């Protein structure tokens, strides 16, 4: 398949969507709700690009790159001004209710939301109203829960239920009061619940065992090992 991104021609797989094809090419599109192992659902609307009908098109239309196939002869723009504005606006909408928590949040320095906030170039707050808050749940010895930091990207429930087959996690409530967690306090019963701390792009689900002796990612010494 042949796609044209910002005037540059690329050869991609036609069975891929535009987000995974462009990320495979080294291009940077911000995204939250898509994961390579979970597929695309088009929830967060962060991955917006401008698709044109053909080469001689100037208006275009904003589409979600995760929900758009990378078919042959596709024409898209990532660095289009309207697409950049919409992606920054999506970051801004996520930031209206986000708590002032980065110094005391275990995801800081390892946070996908921080990275995409910086990537969209959004650094000025004009929202002046109140922020919604949530009570937290006890999720057992491994996973710490902080629902204030949720951006409602649905990654946790999709991984836990659709991928891992777990049954005790879900989404509850409605419009901006969507709550991700268990129906009551208790330990997460899945044997693969620990992948939530990497699946969740924010600091909602955090490694509690790490949190006891917390340090930031840049301060770690890593090695490639085998479990």
């Amino acid at each position: 398949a042949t796609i044209h991104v910002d005037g540059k021609e690329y050869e991609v797989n036609g069975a891929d969507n535009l987000l995974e094809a462009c990320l495979s090419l080294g291009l940077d599109i911000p995204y939250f709700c898509w994961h390579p192992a979970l597929g695309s659902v088009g929830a967060c609307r962060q991955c917006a690009v401008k698709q044109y009908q053909n080469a001689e098109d100037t208006r275009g239309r904003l589409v979600m790159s995760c929900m758009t196939p990378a078919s042959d002869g596709t024409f898209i723009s990532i660095d289009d001004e309207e697409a950049k504005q919409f992606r920054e606006s999506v970051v801004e909408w996520l930031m209206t209710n986000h708590p002032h928590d980065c110094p005391v949040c275990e995801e800081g320095g390892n946070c996908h939301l921080q990275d995409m906030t910086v990537m969209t170039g959004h650094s000025f707050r004009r929202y002046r109203f109140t922020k919604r808050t949530h009570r937290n749940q006890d999720l057992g010895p491994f996973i710490s829960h902080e629902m204030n930091r949720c951006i409602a990207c649905y990654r946790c429930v999709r991984y836990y239920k659709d991928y891992a087959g777990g049954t005790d996690l879900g989404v509850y409530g409605a419009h901006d009061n969507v709550y991700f967690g268990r129906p009551e306090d208790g330990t997460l019963e899945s044997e693969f619940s620990g992948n939530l701390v990497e699946i969740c792009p924010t600091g909602v689900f955090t490694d509690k065992t790490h949190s006891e002796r917390y340090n930031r990612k840049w301060d770690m010494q890593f090695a490639p090992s085998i479990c």
Partner: protein, 439 residues
């Protein structure tokens, strides 16, 4: 009003005492004759072609062709499990037409679902009805029992070997369930988030099976088409939209109500001749043509016909064609605040722009109503209308949410600027840190 069967196919069977018409009275008034003709003399493909040739459009608010929607069902004969769903949710504010249709003429809906299910080869049908319509549920269940007793529902209908079962599914009170894919999700017992298209419900809808979702009024328009012919339905009005439509006016008018009119009737004819005009001492300020999710229009727009393309070229949507009048005593900021509170609290929460941008507009409108608006608030509202349009959100709930806000800002900007009375302040002063004084 003189209601003949040829000019008022949907409302001529209505009684004077507003009582429901049961099976004997319905069948005396040429009831289940279109069903008899469809099930004993026509192929399902022939019925789909006749519905498409009649030009029947969707009455749920989108105005899409019913025959074109029915033709998207697969021709694969291996798929023999098919569903017909009747969107009796009707949760759009300003809309009260399906309540009239199902409270007093339930057998019209039953016959329409029977004909459409035979056309679509749908073995099952569900009436997705809102829970607040208790009398409609009682009447629909009684009519379904009467039709099953008479052999019009169940196994071997009219001796033709066609099996069809009709159920009533009462809702649990959310506006987003009226959206067709969210309706399908709600029927499956899930949270009523909408689904992404493609694939359409005609290919994989309810429980993965081929499914067609249609409004109550569309299904009520079907039996008149199949009982009187395509050329009768095409000759009701000389407009691009064939057939009749339940139109009305609500608000502070003298006679708020609902009347069956052909497409092309102007809004001033509905407002003055049928609704009786405004009340005494009230001056007409604005109107909404088709429910809470349609753009406001001014007094100068009252002269154009109530058609899809005529209202669409005016900057609004025909919608349900149940218009609402706004007098001069209504503050537009307060009205749009009420509308946006409804829309923000009826967000399903799936996608970011609706879920996290409608409450911001609500808070801005609350500040404007209280006189605590700040500079940049109207610009924020305009950018919210720009960025919540079609394609930017996952479903069409948020474009409908931002239509009245942008129309009221366009036509009544002086009321929104009156709410801005304090300078912009997002930061408090921190002692010891000199602020960066931006210009």
């Amino acid at each position: 009003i003189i209601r003949t069967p040829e000019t008022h196919p949907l409302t001529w069977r209505l009684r004077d005492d507003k009582q429901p018409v049961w099976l004997d009275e319905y069948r005396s008034k040429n009831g289940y004759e279109g069903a008899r003709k469809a099930l004993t003399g026509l192929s399902p493909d022939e019925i789909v072609n006749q519905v498409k040739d009649a030009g029947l459009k969707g009455r749920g608010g989108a105005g899409f062709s019913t025959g074109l929607k029915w033709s998207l069902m697969p021709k694969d004969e291996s798929m023999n499990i098919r569903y017909l769903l009747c969107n009796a949710d009707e949760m759009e504010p300003g809309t009260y037409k399906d309540r009239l249709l199902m409270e007093q003429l339930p057998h019209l809906l039953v016959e329409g679902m029977l004909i459409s299910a035979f056309a679509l080869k749908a073995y099952r049908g569900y009436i997705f009805l809102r829970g607040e319509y208790i009398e409609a549920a009682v009447n629909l269940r009684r009519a379904i029992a009467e039709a099953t007793e008479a052999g019009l529902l169940g196994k071997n209908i009219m001796g033709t070997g066609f099996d069809f079962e009709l159920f009533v599914h009462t809702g649990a009170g959310r506006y987003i369930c009226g959206e067709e894919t969210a309706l399908i999700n709600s029927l499956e017992g899930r949270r009523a988030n909408p689904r992404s298209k493609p694939p359409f419900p005609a290919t994989s809808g309810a429980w993965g099976k081929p499914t067609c979702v249609n409004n109550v009024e569309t299904l009520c328009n079907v039996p008149a088409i199949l009982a009187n012919g395509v050329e009768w339905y095409q000759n009701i009005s000389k407009s691009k939209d064939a057939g009749t439509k339940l139109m009305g006016f609500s608000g502070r008018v003298k006679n708020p109500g609902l009347w069956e009119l052909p497409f092309g009737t102007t809004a001033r004819e509905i407002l003055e001749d049928y609704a009786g005009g405004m009340r005494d001492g009230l001056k007409f300020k604005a109107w909404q043509p088709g429910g809470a999710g349609t753009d406001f229009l001014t007094e100068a727009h009252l002269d154009l016909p109530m058609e899809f393309e005529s209202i669409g070229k005016a900057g609004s949507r025909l919608g349900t064609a149940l218009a609402m009048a706004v007098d001069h005593e209504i503050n537009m900021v307060s009205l749009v605040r009420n509308l946006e509170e409804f829309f923000a609290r009826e967000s399903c929460g799936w996608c970011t722009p609706c879920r996290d941008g409608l409450p911001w507009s609500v808070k801005i409108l609350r500040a404007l109503e209280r006189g605590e608006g700040q500079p940049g608030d109207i610009e924020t509202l305009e950018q919210l209308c720009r960025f919540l349009g079609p394609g930017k959100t996952f479903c069409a709930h948020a474009p409908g949410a931002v239509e009245p806000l942008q129309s009221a800002i366009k036509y009544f900007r002086e009321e929104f600027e009156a709410g801005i009375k304090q300078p912009f302040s997002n930061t408090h002063l921190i002692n010891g840190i000199q602020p960066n004084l931006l210009k």
